C-alpha cells in the first residue's frame, strides 16, 4: 500500500512515495526539516515559544472587558487587532485550493474544476489497509452506536452564551448559499460554483433563474402582496423550480433563490426579509439615480446587500458566538498593506464542522404555540399565520441548544446527523488529530482529554479504542465546551480560518472594488457600512421589533 | 446623453451619473483629487517627477550591454531588478477584474461569468452621440479605407529583431489556448473558461474532450505512427470534433486540444512537439514513479508542461520580442514577499493587440518550397512530407514581418484585419488616447507623432480628422516603430502588464505550488526550471535541430 498511508509528514509537509514502500516528505516552507519534516529551524524554536494558545487567546479576548470597553473605543489599535485577526487566520487556508475528494495530490483537475469541494487535508488513500491509514480496526464503529451513544439528545440542554432561533435560521440561510451539495454526484461536489458570498440563495445560481426571479423595472424583484404583507412570487408565476411536497397549494409555493429555502419557514422568513431588502435598495438608489435603468440599479443593489450580509455577519453574526469583549470590524481597507489572496474555494470539512444538528430545539415556539418537527417541515402556512414580525419576536426569545458538550442531537433528525458521519467517511477523511495538527492545535491524548468528562469518554474508547481513530464530526458535537460556551476549541481553530477567508475573499473588498462608486455613490456604500441584523428587521419587518442574536 | 460619455475622469478616476446631466468622478486611491481627479497630491506631484518614461526605460535596457552582461551574473540584483519588473507591471491590471463588453460597471455578472472577455476599459455607452464618446462624427471611417492605406502590405518589411518564423507559430499555438472567442456569442465571449496557461489546447477545455485525447496508460496521451513519427490521433479514432473543410481525408484529420490547429500546419507543428513532450515526461516520471497509476502520471505530467510553457515564454518568447540585453528569469520565489494576486482573467483588449497579422509572411517556405496561403491553409499532408526535422529547420530561417510600422498586412488574410478593426467597433472600444492614459502613457497630440513620419499620418488625419478620435487596433500596426524593433511604445507598455499577469498569476507559480512535491519530485521540478525551446525541439524533433526565435 502507499507508503504514505501512514501520514508520516509532519508540520504541512506533503508525503509522496519514491518506491512502492518508499516515501519522501516535502518540508518546503514549512519551518521545518527531517525525514518527516519535525526537526525545527531556529526561528521556528522561537516562534514554537512564543505563540500562546489558542485557549489562551481566548481567555484574554473573553475577559478583561472593562479594558476592552477601552480597546473597542480606540481605532488605531482597534484597527490594528482587527488587522490582526484577519490576516494570522488567513494562512491556515491554502490559496489557490489544492485537494479534493478524488485528488490527495495537486493537479489542474483539482484546481479547475469547481464542481468540487476543496480540501483542508488530502483524502485518505483508496488501498490504505485502514480507513484512517494505518491506525485502527479494518472498519470503524457503527455510526448508529456513535450516534445514540454520545450524540443523540436526551434532555434538552440550551446554549450557555443564549443563542436564539433568530441565530439558527440565519446561519442556516446564510451558510447555503454555498452549501449546496450536488447529491447526483457525491457528498464531495457543490452546486455552488460562485464558491462564496454571492447571495445566490436570493437571486439564483444561473442568469436563468435570476431573470425569472427578477421584477425587470426599477431593478427589483418578483413578489406578491398577501394581507397587504410582502412575500417572494409563487412557482406558477415564475416557473422557477423550487422543491416540495406535491400536495402544498399553489399560492403556498414562494420561489426564491435556494431551492430548498421552502424547507423550513424558518429559512422563508429571511428568503422574505431579503427579498424586501433588495427592492428597498432599489428606491434608494432610484432616489439618488433616476438616470439608471432597471439593470444597473439591479446589479448594484446585489452588491449592496452582499456587503450588508458580510458587514452583519462579522459585526453580529460572528461577533456573537465568538463571545468576544472585543469588538469586530468589517473594514477591507485593514488588507490592503497585507498579502491576501481576494478568492475562495469551498472546503469539505468547512460544511462538515458546520452541521450544527443540535442547534435545533425539540418545539418550534411561535407566538403561543408548540410546533413539532413535523407540523414545521415544508409549512409556509405557519408563516402567513402569524406573520415576519411574530416570527422574530418568537424567534428572538426561543433558545438553541448547545452544540458541543455532548448528547444533544435532537432524534427527529437521527439520520441527518448519521449522515454527517457516514458521508465524512465515504469522503475518506482523515481524523481529528490530523485535522488538529493541520490547525497547529495539539494532538489530543485522551478521549477524556477531548470531552474533560468520564462516561461518554468512555463510550468512545469502547467504539474507538485508539485516540488517534476518533473521527472529526462527533468530536466535535462531544468536544468539551468551551468555558460557558457553545463551542469547542476544534470547532472554532477550525472554522474560523475558513470562514474569515470566504468574506473577505470576496472581490467587493479588494481595492478596486471597495469604493464609493461601486456601490451608487457614498448613500448606497453607507448602506454596507451601518449594515446590521437589527436594522435589516427594523426596516423590512411592520412594527420595527427589536431583534438580536441573543435572549434578552 | 449619458453624463459620463466625455470620458471626464482622469488618472483611474472611475466616472458615476449623479442626475441625467451630471457626472461624479470616484478619485479613491488615485493619487489625484479635484472634479475629474487631476489635482495631485503632493508624493504624487514627487512621483510624477521621478517616474521616467517607457522609452526611457527601453534605451536602457536595450543599450549597455558589457554592463547588463555583469548585471546577468550577479544572482541577487538578477533578481532584485526581474522582482521590480514582475511587480511594476502588475499594477496596471485590475484583479479581481472589474468590467467586460455588456458591463461599463463594476457588477456580479461582469466578475462571475467567466464566459466573458474581461475588460481594461469600460465599454463606451450605447446611448453616446459618437463611438467615441463625444468626440469625432457620428460614424467611424470606412475600415475598408483604413484598411487599404496605411494597413495593407506593399512590399514585405521584415523585421529588423529578426524573428521567424518559429516565433510567429509559437505565439498563434502559445495564446491561443486562451485566446478562443465564442463567435456564436459575440468577439466579447470566450471560451477559454481557464482565463490562462492552461494547456488545454493541448488536452482540452473539457473533461470529455480530454478522455478521448488520453491513451490512459502510463499517463499518456494517444498518438498515431506515420513514417516512424508520431503524430497526433485521428478523428475517426478518437471521435474528438474538429475543424476540417470535409474533404480532407480521415488519416489527415488530426486530433488536439485546440479545435482550429488543424487551420495551418504551423500549429499542427507544435501540436505534435507538444504532444511527444507530454509522453516524454510520462515516461520520466514513471521512471521515478513505478507505483504510480495513469491517472497521476497525467495530471503530474499536465502541471509539468504548463511550468515548461511559463518558462519558456518568459526566458525565450518574451527574452527575444524584448529586445532586452538583461536576461530575463522564471521565478515565482520573486513574488513570495510581494502583494500579488495569484488568478488571472482575459481582457478584450488583449486579444486585440495580438492580432499579430503583419507577422504572417507571403509565402510559407520549407526546405526548397514556397506555398501560398492557399496551398498552406488545411493542408496537414505538407506536415507528413518534409517532417518535423525539415519544419523547424525551414522556419528557423524563414523571416516574419514587421507588426508596427505601417502597410505591412499581407492582403491575402485582409478581411482578417477588417474584422479586428470591425469586431473593436462592434464592442465599443475607447479610443487610443484614452487606453494610453489607462496605462500611464501621455497621449499623442498628433497622427505624425504617432508615426513618426507624414505620410501615412496625412492619410489618417484625412479619415479620423481628430487625433482624439483615433481607433487602438489600427494604431498599434502603424505606430512609430522603436529603434530598429518590432513594436511601438503602445503594443509593448499595453501588452505586458496582460502577459505577465496571465503567467504569473498561475496557480502553480503560488508558494503552496511551487515546490517539487507538485511536480513528482526534483526530478519532474527540474525539468521545468530547465525547459527552453531549444530542448523542446531537441528532445522531441528528429535529429534535434538548432532551433531559436531568431534568425541567424
Ligand atoms: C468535474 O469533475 C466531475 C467528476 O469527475 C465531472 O463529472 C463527470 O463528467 C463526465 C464527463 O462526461 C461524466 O461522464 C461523468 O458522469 C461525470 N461524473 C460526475 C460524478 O459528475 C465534471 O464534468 C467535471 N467538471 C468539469 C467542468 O470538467
Ligand atoms: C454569461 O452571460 C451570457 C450573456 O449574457 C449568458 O448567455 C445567455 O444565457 C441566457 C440564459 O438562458 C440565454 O437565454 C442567452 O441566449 C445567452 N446569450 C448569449 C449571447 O450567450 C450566459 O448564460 C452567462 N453565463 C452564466 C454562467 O451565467
Ligand atoms: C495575561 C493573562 C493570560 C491568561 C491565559 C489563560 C491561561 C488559562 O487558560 C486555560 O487554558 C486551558 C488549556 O486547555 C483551558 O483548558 C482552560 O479552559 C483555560 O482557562
Ligand atoms: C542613460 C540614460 C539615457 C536616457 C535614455 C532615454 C533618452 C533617449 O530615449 C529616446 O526617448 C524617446 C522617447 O522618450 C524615443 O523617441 C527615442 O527613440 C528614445 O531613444
Ligand atoms: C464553524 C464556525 C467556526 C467559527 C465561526 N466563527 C468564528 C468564531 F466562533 C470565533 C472566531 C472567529 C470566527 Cl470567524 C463560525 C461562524 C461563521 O463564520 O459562520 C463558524
Ligand atoms: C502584446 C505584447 C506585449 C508585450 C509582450 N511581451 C513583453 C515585451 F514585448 C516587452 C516587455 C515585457 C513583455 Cl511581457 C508580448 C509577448 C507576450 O507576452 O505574449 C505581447
Ligand atoms: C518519522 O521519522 C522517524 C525518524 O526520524 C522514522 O523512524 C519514522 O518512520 C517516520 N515516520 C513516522 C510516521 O513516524
Ligand atoms: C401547518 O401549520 C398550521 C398552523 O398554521 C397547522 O394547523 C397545520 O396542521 C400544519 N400543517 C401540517 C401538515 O401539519
Ligand atoms: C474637468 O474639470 C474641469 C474643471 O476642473 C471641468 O470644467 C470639466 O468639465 C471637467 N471635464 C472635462 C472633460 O474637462
Ligand atoms: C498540399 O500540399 C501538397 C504538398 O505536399 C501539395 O502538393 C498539394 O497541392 C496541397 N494541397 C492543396 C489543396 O493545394
Given at each position: 500500500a502507499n507508503p504514505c498511508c501512514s501520514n508520516p509528514?509532519?508540520?504541512?509537509g506533503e508525503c509522496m512515495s519514491t518506491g512502492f514502500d518508499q516515501y519522501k516528505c516535502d518540508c518546503t516552507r514549512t519551518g521545518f526539516y527531517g525525514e518527516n519534516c519535525t526537526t525545527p529551524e531556529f526561528l521556528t524554536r522561537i516562534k514554537l515559544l512564543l505563540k500562546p494558545t489558542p485557549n489562551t487567546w481566548h481567555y484574554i479576548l473573553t475577559h478583561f472587558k472593562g479594558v476592552w470597553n477601552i480597546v473597542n473605543n480606540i481605532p488605531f489599535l482597534r484597527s490594528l487587532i482587527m488587522k490582526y485577526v484577519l490576516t494570522s487566520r488567513?494562512?491556515?487556508?491554502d490559496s489557490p485550493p489544492t485537494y479534493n475528494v478524488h485528488y490527495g495530490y495537486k493537479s489542474w483537475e483539482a484546481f479547475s474544476n469547481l464542481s468540487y469541494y476543496t480540501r483542508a487535508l488530502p483524502p485518505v488513500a483508496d488501498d490504505c489497509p485502514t480507513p484512517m491509514g494505518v491506525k485502527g480496526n479494518k472498519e470503524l464503529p457503527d455510526s448508529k452506536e456513535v450516534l445514540e451513544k454520545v450524540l443523540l439528545r436526551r434532555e434538552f440542554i440550551p446554549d450557555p452564551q443564549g443563542s436564539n432561533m433568530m441565530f439558527a435560521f440565519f446561519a442556516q440561510h446564510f451558510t447555503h448559499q454555498f452549501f449546496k451539495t450536488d447529491h447526483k454526484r457525491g457528498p464531495g461536489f457543490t452546486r455552488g460554483l460562485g464558491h462564496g458570498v454571492d447571495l445566490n440563495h436570493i437571486y439564483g445560481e444561473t442568469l436563468d433563474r435570476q431573470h425569472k426571479l427578477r421584477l425587470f423595472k426599477d431593478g427589483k424583484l418578483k413578489y406578491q402582496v398577501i394581507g397587504g404583507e410582502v412575500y417572494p412570487p409563487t412557482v406558477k408565476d415564475t416557473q422557477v423550480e423550487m422543491i416540495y411536497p406535491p400536495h402544498i397549494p399553489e399560492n403556498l409555493q414562494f420561489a426564491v433563490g435556494q431551492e430548498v429555502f421552502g424547507l423550513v419557514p424558518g429559512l422563508m422568513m429571511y428568503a422574505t426579509i431579503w427579498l424586501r431588502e433588495h427592492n428597498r435598495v432599489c428606491d434608494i438608489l432610484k432616489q439618488e439615480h433616476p438616470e439608471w435603468g432597471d439593470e444597473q440599479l439591479f446589479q448594484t443593489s446585489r452588491l449592496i446587500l452582499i456587503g450588508e450580509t458580510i458587514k452583519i455577519v462579522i459585526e453580529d453574526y460572528v461577533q456573537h458566538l465568538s463571545g468576544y469583549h472585543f469588538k469586530l470590524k468589517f473594514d477591507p481597507e485593514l488588507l490592503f498593506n497585507q498579502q491576501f489572496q481576494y478568492q475562495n474555494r469551498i472546503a469539505s470539512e468547512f460544511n462538515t464542522l458546520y452541521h450544527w444538528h443540535p442547534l435545533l430545539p425539540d418545539t418550534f415556539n411561535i407566538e403561543d404555540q408548540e410546533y413539532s418537527f413535523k407540523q414545521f417541515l415544508y409549512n409556509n402556512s405557519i408563516l402567513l399565520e402569524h406573520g415576519l414580525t411574530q416570527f422574530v419576536e418568537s424567534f428572538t426569545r426561543q433558545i438553541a441548544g448547545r452544540v458541543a458538550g455532548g448528547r444533544n442531537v435532537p432524534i427527529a433528525v437521527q439520520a441527518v446527523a448519521k449522515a454527517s458521519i457516514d458521508q465524512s467517511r465515504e469522503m475518506k477523511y482523515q481524523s481529528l488529530n490530523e485535522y488538529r495538527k493541520r490547525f497547529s492545535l495539539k494532538p489530543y491524548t485522551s478521549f477524556e482529554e477531548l470531552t474533560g468528562e468520564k462516561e461518554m469518554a468512555a463510550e468512545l474508547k469502547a467504539l474507538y479504542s485508539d485516540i488517534d481513530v476518533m473521527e472529526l464530526y462527533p468530536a466535535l458535537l462531544v468536544?468539551?465546551?468551551?468555558?460557558?460556551?457553545?463551542?469547542?476549541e476544534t470547532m472554532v481553530e477550525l472554522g474560523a480560518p475558513f470562514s474569515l477567508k470566504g468574506l473577505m475573499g470576496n472581490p467587493i473588498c479588494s481595492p478596486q472594488y471597495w469604493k464609493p462608486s461601486t456601490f451608487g455613490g457614498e448613500v448606497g456604500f453607507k448602506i454596507i457600512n451601518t449594515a446590521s441584523i437589527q436594522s435589516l428587521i427594523c426596516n423590512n419587518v411592520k412594527g420595527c421589533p427589536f431583534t438580536s442574536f441573543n435572549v434578552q
Open positions: 509528514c509532519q508540520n504541512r488567513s494562512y491556515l487556508i468536544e468539551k465546551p468551551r468555558p460557558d460556551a457553545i463551542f469547542g
